[PDB]
Assembly symmetry: C2
Homo-oligomer: 443 residues x 2
């Protein structure tokens, strides 16, 4: 029986309700607490023992590997030119991303209003962003916005009501008068608040999201399997990087579509809130031991971005295809993790360190240990994603009655450069899995 | 598809036939820019820049619940959604085509880009190349081109006949808000200099700029078949933003490999000629490059570089002989812009470059239909055999970037077909 991704999603659909289990110690999480930004984790030694911002120490390791003809830690390249080429591809992939994630809200690409954008100015005579909505029916709007999402580069798209528990209490950002070249030295915190205002607006003191901001649209941006399977080496860094620029394009495209439909839209990429939780509530997939959203189509080998809006929409149903029970017995990511960051224990409500948000039931991982491996390896690792059985393209089988996971699944870089590739790194052997008709956009 | 393209490869040599009269063509002569064609009436009889008159028709259509000229939408909501999708598609494109060289997204150096600055401590853009072998470089850069969103990619030596003699641009310190009102003409010249450079007087391409890399960016078939209505405008628009990201991504890769790279999108030179010389397809009666995978339903962009590369062979799969007897685009064109006659070396008007054997079309007649219809037409692309209602499009099949899984296998690539 030929694989039917739509059938699979329908088979495992849940009844409505946020799947994330929480208790009374839950409070919104200040973004500065992530390992990338917090002072306790931001600094890492380089290979000479010099203590630096982690990404500068990682740069030192990239340079060292190129000079030594390596594609990764102790991984010899074919020659220096191949080592150089992998890092050139990685660096280029980030072209449309600011400071590794686009996290500053309402700066650079992540503007909360389209008014100053060159595209908005060019189109101003038509008045699409000033004319009241011609469609308020959530059913039709869901079909329109999901169609637009696929045009804008999403491989998966889902809708959820906005759960404010996953919106950061304070964002990391920069003052509005700070030019890019000083941005990394002038980062500040700024509260994200919800108020009775008509439009998203930023004051000197606050980023203000309107109380009318009902919905979040979550996109999955598929990474390339062959390149991620080289983790922790450079080609895994390149598929990561290119997908961050795809995320940025998605956010801007979709926000402009929503604005030109007469609503407002807030982009975010890696900023504003916790993408994994939104993705789980929007039904893209389930949380996992490693901490990523695992999808039926791509496993965890998929990036996430999201857009917040007042556009009326129909929320999607969460999905339960057994990930929690497989993660309970699998632990491959924990065993293979080069830094032992991933727990082999049970889920708890108690954060392992400052980097975890306490009060939600999850596997609690040590993300300072994870980040510490990045300067050592000169990359963004990804070994957990690479070894997860759900990342394999071969997991789904049909037994004549229904779909199921094949339990047998759970028991070099020159060839990548010389091997299979297609547009955006997508794989035509599986691309049919993300075909979409109206019936699977809105019910 | 790899079998087909090898089967139809020609021996080396530009297939475009030229004569002694050929001269490089000033970009201002295109119908989009030239003063004789730029102003068009709207439906009220008011003469405006053609795209503003076209805007007025889009507004009139939304108000009247239409997706195109005399084409009722399901309701006003559907009409609005089609124009919202079209407008959004252009997000990463400046003034319909990114033609101003070394402005906005089309910078000729990576030095000021936020990504280059972030990566500066690694020194990839200042380190000499570690690879000079054109075979390996061709494989690397084509792999990168596919990562960067090209559905097709080819390489040719740069033929300066197709580089505009003078570009349309704006002064470097003019802000976006005044760009449309302060467009100027600036020569593109070739000189013995190390790097692409712009002076007050000239855009200077180095004599070492040996090669052009041409990308095909596939449009969506269902949407283009709604031409001249709004969903054909939307697939057009989204692919212009795909073009811009391709140029920037690939230029950065080439720079981080130790070479220089000039992006262009619709600027700098004539994409159809470059695409034919790079083997993506053949010229056609309508004037487009027709590819085996997509026919003419594919957009083009290109990047110029001194990176050593292996030129691809031109391809001949019989387009010329088919266009000789077909004439379907010419009979369906709503403005009679496309000739039914034979190819000549003599342009029909200022908008054509004389001195090259081609079907000569009247591109002022084409542009005149755009304000009338409120869109970018595309009927010629839609009806062409090589290419093979709006509610059904919105309710129907779609996939990532509008690509089609029924055909996506045709653009799979291994090293054997890259070099
Ligand atoms: O969020 C990410 C992911 C990978 C690399 C970096 Cl630097 C940031
Ligand atoms: O080059 C193009 C193509 C379509 C529309 C416009 Cl305005 C320009
Ligand atoms: S490797 Fe195993 S335990 Fe880890 S996330 Fe994947 S399925 Fe779960
Ligand atoms: S990215 Fe690497 S170091 Fe981090 S959790 Fe995954 S396997 Fe461990
Ligand atoms: S775009 Fe339309 S008007 Fe222009 S040549 Fe093609 S069919 Fe004719
Ligand atoms: S419609 Fe016919 S004559 Fe026109 S470009 Fe296509 S094949 Fe050629």
């Amino acid at each position: 029986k030929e694989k039917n991704a739509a059938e699979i999603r329908q088979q495992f659909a849940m009844t409505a309700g946020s799947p994330i289990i929480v208790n009374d110690k839950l409070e919104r999480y200040a973004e500065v607490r992530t390992a990338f930004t917090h002072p306790t984790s931001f600094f890492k030694p380089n290979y000479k023992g010099e203590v630096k911002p982690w990404f500068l120490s990682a740069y030192d390791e990239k340079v060292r590997q190129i000079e030594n003809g390596e594609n990764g830690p102790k991984m010899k390249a074919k020659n220096v030119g191949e080592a150089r080429a992998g890092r050139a591809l990685e660096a280029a992939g980030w072209t449309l991303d600011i400071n590794y994630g686009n996290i500053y809200p309402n700066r650079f690409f992540m503007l909360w209003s389209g008014e100053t954008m060159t595209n908005t100015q060019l189109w101003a005579p038509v008045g699409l962003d000033r004319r009241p909505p011609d469609t308020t029916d959530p059913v039709e709007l869901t079909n329109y916005v999901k169609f637009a999402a696929r045009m804008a580069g999403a491989d998966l798209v889902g809708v959820a009501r906005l759960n404010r528990n996953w919106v950061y209490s304070e964002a990391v950002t920069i003052p509005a008068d700070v030019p890019y070249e000083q941005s990394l030295h002038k980062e500040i915190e700024k509260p994200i608040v919800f108020k009775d205002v008509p439009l998203p607006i930023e004051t000197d003191d606050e980023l203000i999201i309107p109380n009318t901001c009902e919905n979040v649209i979550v996109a999955g941006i598929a990474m390339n399997r062959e390149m991620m399977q080289t983790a922790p080496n450079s080609m895994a860094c390149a598929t990561t990087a290119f997908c961050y620029s795809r995320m940025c394009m998605f956010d801007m495209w979709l926000c402009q579509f929503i604005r030109y439909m007469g609503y407002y839209a807030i982009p975010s990429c890696n900023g504003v809130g916790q993408s994994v939780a939104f993705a789980v509530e929007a039904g893209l997939g389930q949380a996992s031991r490693m901490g990523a959203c695992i999808t039926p189509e791509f496993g965890p080998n998929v990036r996430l971005t999201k857009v917040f809006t007042n556009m009326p929409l129909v929320p999607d149903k969460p999905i339960d295809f057994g990930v929690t029970e497989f993660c309970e017995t699998c632990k491959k990511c924990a065993r293979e993790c080069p830094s032992k960051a991933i727990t082999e224990g049970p889920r708890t409500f108690e954060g392992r360190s400052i980097h975890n948000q306490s009060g939600k039931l999850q596997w609690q991982n040590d993300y300072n240990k994870c980040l510490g491996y990045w300067p050592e390896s000169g990359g963004y690792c990804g070994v957990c994603v690479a070894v997860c059985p759900f990342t394999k393209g071969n997991i789904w089988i049909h037994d004549g009655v229904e779909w199921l996971i094949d339990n047998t699944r759970f028991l070099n870089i020159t060839e990548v450069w010389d091997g299979k590739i297609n547009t955006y790194g997508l794989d035509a052997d599986h691309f049919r899995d993300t075909v979409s008709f109206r019936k699977d956009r809105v019910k």
